[PDB]
């Protein structure tokens, strides 16, 4: 192991990403990308410049689980390869902001039952599973949440460490 993981998470910022469906998380895992609404895009871009690591922790709505977590490797950009997201009903692709590149740190799931002892000070100390898309998770809570995930032995954090910074 957990030492490189702890190193990557040291003084990180953490954001809860709430996905409408599993398809979009599958695309994010396959392509190493995420795109969010402009209100959250601006927050993530600010955070990317502010901290050594910015961690997105993903949860598919109604799944009762987190599906993994990833580290921003870039601010958002436009004009790249299109991504065929499965958008919420009533939302067009033009409503999204740009695309963030991300490096996955853990592609394994964690059920909410395992994080019930973690509360987020930045959301009224509600359980960390509770939060709108884009809710920031305070450092200690976010670190402990990430450490609860099963180890993902397919991941080598050596290359992520070199990107820090």
Ligand X SMILES: CNC(=S)c1cccnc1
Extract the annotated binding site for RNA.
18-20, 34-35, 85, 133
Pick the piece of the chain touching ligand X (CB under 6 A) from 61-69, 83-91, 117-125, 152-160: 83-91
Give the integer Cα–Cα distance in Å for 109 and 26: 12
Q: Which is nearer to ligand X, 67 or 143 (CB)?
A: 67
* Residue 118 makes contact with ligand X by CB under 6 A: no
* Residue 80 makes contact with ligand X by CB under 6 A: no
| HSE of 51, CA atoms in CB hemisphere, 13 A | 20
* Residue 20 makes contact with ligand X by CB under 6 A: yes
Give the integer Cα–Cα distance in Å for 88 and 92: 8
* Residue 36 makes contact with ligand X by CB under 6 A: yes
* Residue 120 makes contact with ligand X by CB under 6 A: no
- Which residue among 133, 138, 139, 157 contacts ligand X (CB under 6 A)? 133
Give the integer Cα–Cα distance in Å for 12 and 139: 7
* Residue 88 makes contact with ligand X by CB under 6 A: yes
Spatial strand order of the sheet with 99-106 comes to 33-35, 99-106, 68-72, 54-60, 13-19, 136-137
Q: How far is the CB of 95 from ligand X (least distance, A)?
A: 8
Pick the piece of the chain touching ligand X (CB under 6 A) from 33-41, 48-56, 120-128, 150-158: 33-41
Query: Is the separation of the CB atoms in 39 and 76 below 8 Å?
Result: no
Give the integer Cα–Cα distance in Å for 27 and 159: 21
Task: Please tell me the chain's helix, strand, coil percentages from 3-state DSSP, rounded to the nearest 5.
Answer: 35, 25, 40
- Which residue among 9, 13, 24, 59 contacts ligand X (CB under 6 A)? 24
Interacting residues with ligand X (CB under 6 A): 20, 24, 35-37, 85, 87-88, 96, 133
């Amino acid at each position: 192991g957990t030492s490189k993981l702890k190193y990557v998470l040291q003084d990180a910022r953490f954001f809860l990403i709430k996905s409408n469906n599993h398809e979009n998380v599958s695309l994010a895992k396959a392509k190493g990308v995420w795109s969010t609404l402009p209100v959250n895009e601006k927050k993530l871009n600010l955070a990317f410049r502010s901290a050594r690591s910015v961690i997105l922790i993903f949860s598919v709505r109604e799944s009762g689980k987190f599906q993994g977590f990833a580290r921003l490797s870039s601010e958002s950009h436009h004009g790249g390869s299109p991504i065929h997201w499965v958008l919420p009903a009533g939302m067009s692709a033009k409503m999204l902001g740009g695309v963030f590149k991300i490096d996955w740190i853990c592609r394994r799931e964690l059920p909410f039952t395992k994080s019930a002892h973690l509360t987020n000070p930045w959301n009224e100390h509600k359980p960390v599973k509770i939060g709108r898309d884009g809710q920031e998770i305070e450092l200690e809570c976010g670190t402990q949440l990430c450490l609860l995930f099963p180890p993902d032995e397919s991941i080598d954090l050596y290359q992520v460490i070199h990107k820090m910074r």
